[PDB]
Amino acid sequence: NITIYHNPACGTSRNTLEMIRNSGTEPTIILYLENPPSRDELVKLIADMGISVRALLAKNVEPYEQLGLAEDKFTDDQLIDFMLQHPILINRPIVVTPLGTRLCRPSEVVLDILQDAQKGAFTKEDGEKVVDEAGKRL
Ligand SMILES: [Cs+]
Ligand SMILES: [Cs+]
Ligand SMILES: [Cs+]
Ligand SMILES: [Cs+]
């Protein structure tokens, strides 16, 4: 049972999706930009990821810039509500499996929570080797 909050226009997200597939399961794919999680779901993801609310913020997207979010003037709940109102602020990809939830940045973070091993060598789309044929992380 795997879910990925995916942005097809982001290389890290594409790389993550293909690593998931290379472990042999096809995940549930949520285009968070158009189908963002609910407030309750979003709080849970953040808790399960073990990161701060602010570490989940995508920088260099228009709401981050225009809302002044780089400044330390926002509570965590304010930041969660901005994320819900402007889903492009949610950094990507988030992946949930039976073993846990991670913000998969860099994409190979996802190897921690995939239950089955990669089924063969995996190379990122830009040529960066991740795992060889033997299954060793390079
Ligand atoms: Cs939802
Ligand atoms: Cs693992
Ligand atoms: Cs292998
Ligand atoms: Cs890259």
Curated annotation (Swiss-Prot):
E.C. number(s) listed in UniProt: 1.20.4.1
Site entry: Important for activity. Involved in arsenate binding and transition-state stabilization: A58, R92, R105
One GO MF term: arsenate reductase (glutaredoxin) activity
Record's catalysed reaction(s): [glutaredoxin]-dithiol + arsenate + glutathione + H(+) = glutathionyl-S-S-[glutaredoxin] + arsenite + H2O
Regulation: Inhibited by the thiol reagents iodoacetate (IAA) and N-ethylmaleimide (NEM). Activity is rapidly inactivated by the histidine-modifying reagent diethylpyrocarbonate (DEPC).
A Gene Ontology BP annotation from the UniProt entry: response to arsenic-containing substance
Summary of pH dependence: Optimum pH is 6.3-6.8.
Outcome (variant: D126E): 7-fold decrease in catalytic efficiency with arsenate. Mutant is relatively resistant to arsenate, but is more sensitive at higher concentrations
Site (Important for activity. Lowers pKa of the active site Cys) residue list: H6
Result of changing D126A: 4-fold decrease in catalytic efficiency with arsenate. Mutant is relatively resistant to arsenate, but is more sensitive at higher concentrations
Domain of life per record: Bacteria
Catalytic residue list: C10 (nucleophile)
Enzyme class: oxidoreductase
InterPro entries for the chain: Arsenate_reductase, Arsenate_reductase-like, Thioredoxin-like_sf
Phenotype for E128D: 5-fold decrease in catalytic efficiency with arsenate. Mutant is relatively resistant to arsenate, but is more sensitive at higher concentrations
Gene3D superfamilies: Glutaredoxin (3.40.30.10)
Quaternary structure note: Monomer in solution.
Biological role: Involved in resistance to arsenate. Catalyzes the reduction of arsenate [As(V)] to arsenite [As(III)]. The resulting arsenite is then extruded from the cell via the ArsAB transport system.
Matching PANTHER family: ARSENATE REDUCTASE, ARSENATE REDUCTASE-RELATED
Name by which UniProt lists this protein: Arsenate reductase
Taxonomic source organism: Escherichia coli
Gene: arsC
